[PDB]
């Protein structure tokens, strides 16, 4: 089994290549992580399993999700080392992703009321909504267009929060720059219409995610950062004229970046929109690990290792039904069907701990 075939992943050896997507729960409740946080976590944990955390804010302003976890305050790290140390106990590798939603916020969101920050000043269409803290739906606001000199104060708080990551006792972090979110927004050459160093060019596009990825991997080292990426996806009206184009510009300055650094990423997270030749021509071209996402299965996911299409595989919607995927997909067990309408709620057991296991 292709999937159980141990894998080196840095300095983390890996006893199969099930991966946990970064998913928002919307359990921890007041950005705070909760207890049942860490039930859920240690439920799914497995020894040599790699984990990755729902998006984490890296700002008071990182937030367009109602009850999303942080990791900017004291109070963040001290719940989640309490956390990290479950999961460490099952033996599992746990990176946590650092979320900023750009312009995918709300002002109830926004403390002092205040539009969302991003690259532009567009609005993201009324065909898609946010999730309000009473349930209901919210129309996106339209966001500033920030300026050269907040982009590295953005820049400095991915740094800051993955020192408080490493602080709270996570193995590394990813950078979650995909689904149309802030590094998304600045990517997308259908959302950025910067006229400065940030904007037109693909090289401006990308220098955005470059900054950000270069100062996580000066703070806690490359083979501590993971990047997932988002080439083709039409979420939050996050499209691009050439995907694949943008892909591999991200993917030439990721290459850069390690051969500068002197030391490899931990590796490179690409989520499908679910041809084919877009995930195989990035992970061809990417010098390192490569994790695929996105509408994989059992058969799917070994196909994707055996033929050397990806490292790693990560599966999202079927690790929230499933507690023990991993050890469901070593013995083709079925696999439980997810209740979507409990996917953002807050109940800490009901839709997050309570499904049953083999
Ligand atoms: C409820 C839910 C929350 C998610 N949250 C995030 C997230 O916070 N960050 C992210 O990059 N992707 C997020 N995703 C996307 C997943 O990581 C993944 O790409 C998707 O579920 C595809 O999974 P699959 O391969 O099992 O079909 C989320 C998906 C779901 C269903």
Redesign the pocket.
């Known amino acids: 089994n292709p999937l159980f075939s141990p894998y080196k992943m840095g300095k983390f050896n890996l006893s199969h290549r099930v991966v946990l ?5 919307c359990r921890a409740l007041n950005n705070i992580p909760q207890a049942a946080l860490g039930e859920y976590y240690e439920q799914r944990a497995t020894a040599g399993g790699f984990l990755i955390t ?2 984490t804010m890296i700002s008071p302003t990182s937030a367009g999700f109602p009850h999303v976890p942080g990791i900017f305050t004291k109070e963040q790290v001290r719940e989640w080392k309490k956390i990290v140390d479950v999961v460490h106990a099952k033996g599992a590798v746990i990176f946590c ?1 650092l ?1 900023h939603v750009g312009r995918a916020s709300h002002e109830v969101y926004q403390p002092a009321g205040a539009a969302p920050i991003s690259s532009t000043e567009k609005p993201i269409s009324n065909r898609w909504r946010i999730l309000m803290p009473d349930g209901t739906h919210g129309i996106y606001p339209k966001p500033r267009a920030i300026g050269t000199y907040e982009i590295s104060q953005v820049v400095e708080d991915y740094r800051r929060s993955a020192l408080n990551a490493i602080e709270a006792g996570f193995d590394g972090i990813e950078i ?1 720059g ?2 149309g979110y802030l590094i998304d927004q600045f990517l997308k050459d259908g959302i950025n219409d910067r006229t400065d160093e940030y904007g037109g060019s693909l090289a401006n596009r990308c220098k955005f995610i470059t900054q950000v990825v270069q100062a996580v991997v000066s703070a806690i080292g490359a083979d501590r950062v993971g990047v ?1 990426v988002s080439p083709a996806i039409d979420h939050l009206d996050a499209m691009d004229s050439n995907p694949l184009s943008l892909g591999l510009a991200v993917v030439e300055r990721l290459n850069k970046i390690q051969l500068h650094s002197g030391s490899k990423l931990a590796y490179l997270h690409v ?1 499908q929109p ?1 041809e084919a030749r877009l995930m195989r021509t990035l992970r061809n071209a990417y010098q390192g690990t490569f994790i695929c ?4 299965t059992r058969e799917l996911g070994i196909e994707a290792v055996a033929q050397g299409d990806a490292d790693l595989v ?7 039904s499933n507690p023990d995927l991993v050890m469901r997909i070593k013995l083709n067990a079925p696999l439980n069907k997810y209740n979507r309408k409990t ?2 709620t807050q109940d800490p057991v009901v839709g997050y701990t309570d499904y049953p296991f083999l």
Request: charge should be positive.
């Open positions: 997507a970064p998913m928002t729960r729902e998006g992703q979320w979650h995909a689904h997932r989520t679910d996402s996105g509408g994989y990560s599966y999202g919607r079927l690790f929230i996917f953002y």
